[PDB]
């Protein structure tokens, strides 16, 4: 009998996949769950289910966390007065703006169809403002810039794939989570393009 399978099938993978974020915490919690499960067979499953039953609360929070990811945070802001750099600041502003409003448009087919078109445009236009700004840096010193462009392109694909799954699923949290990652990424674009400049 395995009332204990979910420890290994859910919790272990969950901790394993969070090791790069923090290692020690992943380890201490694994150990905590293992000890709890051995003293109390079936406890991990009961815990997992009680988390899954809080789906509403967790959706509401993830919405808030996304809505808040936008507003101009006093850190990432390129000081350079050049037109190319300024165009970058604002195209990122527009993308972060549009991605942050997803929570309040997703529950309407028509409006969300418009939003998807605008997000696509906002991404493309940011890609243009990143491409236009390359010339401002010494061409033998763009490793970080190029690398950060690729990573942004990866997470943009990732968001597009997430958005594709939504129409088959209907599960909005994936979209929200993916959209928040993308915001974090456009921030890293701003961070990278500010450090080399």
């Amino acid at each position: 009998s395995m009332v204990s399978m979910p420890l290994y099938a859910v919790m272990y993978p969950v901790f394993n996949e969070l090791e790069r974020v923090n290692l020690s915490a992943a380890q201490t919690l694994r150990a905590a769950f293992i000890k709890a499960e051995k003293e109390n067979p079936g406890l991990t499953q009961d815990i997992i289910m009680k988390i899954l039953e809080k789906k509403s609360v967790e959706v509401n929070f993830t919405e808030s966390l996304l809505r808040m990811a936008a507003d101009d945070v006093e850190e990432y802001m390129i000081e350079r007065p050049e037109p190319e750099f300024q165009d970058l600041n604002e195209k990122a502003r527009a993308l972060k703006q549009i991605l942050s409003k997803i929570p309040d448009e997703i529950n309407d087919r028509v409006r969300f169809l418009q939003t998807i078109k605008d997000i696509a445009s906002a991404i493309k236009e940011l890609l243009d403002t990143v491409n236009n700004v390359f010339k401002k840096y010494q061409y033998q010193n763009r490793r970080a810039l190029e690398h950060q462009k690729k990573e942004f392109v990866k997470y943009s694909k990732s968001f597009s794939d997430t958005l594709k799954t939504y129409f088959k699923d209907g599960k909005a949290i994936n979209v929200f989570v993916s959209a928040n990652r993308l915001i974090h990424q456009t921030n890293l674009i701003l961070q990278t393009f500010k450090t080399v400049a």
Binding site: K124, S156, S160
Partner: peptide
Amino acid sequence: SELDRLLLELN
């Protein structure tokens, strides 16, 4: 169509 339009410009 807009779903594919993103992937093309990203690739």
